[PDB]
């Protein structure tokens, strides 16, 4: 039944990680971010209300699909000014299907390490051309009608199917940051980065 608590845990995590990525990749100016501590790590978090709302609407809508485990990967895509994908932060997900105490805090211990990898990830990636936008993509496991239904959870925040233009990146080179395993969660974060 744990479907919902892992979804809980992951959503709290992806919010942290998304914010940090927008900061570290400089998709938004230093100045709307405020220093915070999460999983006991120094992080940044926008306090621009609409950006925050945006990121939240997204995670709120994904949540139920995590609960039933239909999401295969969640990907944050940085786009150049021509709307061509420059790089993607790929969170590949598994939820293996029971429990003896403090499992959750061990899981957050492991996620902390992802947050760090993100915060020192300029060391391994080439910087983007300026005027980059970003977007979120949710790759479902199954191509399923049911998926569209459970994702349409806020009117005023619809989802559509992606185009080839949203996903095609020519010649990707791969930069893994972090992998983890546990009884409840298996996840890896790698970056797919455009070649030139």
């Amino acid at each position: 039944n744990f479907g919902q608590v892992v979804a809980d845990v992951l959503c709290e995590f992806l919010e942290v990680a998304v914010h940090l990525i927008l900061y570290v990749r400089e998709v938004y100016p230093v100045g709307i971010f405020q220093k915070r501590k999460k999983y006991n790590v120094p992080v940044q978090m926008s306090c621009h209300p609409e950006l925050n709302q945006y990121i939240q609407d997204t995670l709120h809508c994904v949540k139920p699909l995590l609960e039933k485990n239909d999401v295969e990967k969640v990907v944050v895509v940085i786009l150049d000014k021509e709307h061509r994908p420059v790089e993607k932060f790929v969170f590949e997900i598994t939820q293996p299907p029971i429990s003896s105490d403090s499992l959750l805090s061990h899981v957050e211990q492991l996620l902390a390490a992802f947050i760090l990898k993100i915060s020192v990830c300029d060391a391994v990636l080439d910087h983007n051309p300026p005027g980059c936008t970003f977007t979120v993509l949710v790759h479902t496991r199954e191509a399923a009608t049911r998926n569209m239904e459970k994702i349409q959870v806020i009117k005023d925040f619809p989802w559509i199917l992606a185009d080839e233009q949203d996903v095609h990146m020519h010649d990707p080179r791969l930069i893994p940051l972090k992998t983890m395993t546990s009884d409840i969660l298996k996840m890896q974060l790698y970056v797919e980065e455009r070649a030139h």
Binding site: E50, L51, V136, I160, L161, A162, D166
Partner: peptide, 21 residues
């Protein structure tokens, strides 16, 4: 290439609308 990829219709706020502070 298939359609198991979902996307929000709405765009995140532009760099400009932020600098609107």
């Amino acid at each position: 290439r298939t359609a198991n990829i979902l996307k929000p219709l709405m765009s995140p706020p532009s760099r400009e609308e932020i600098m609107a502070t």
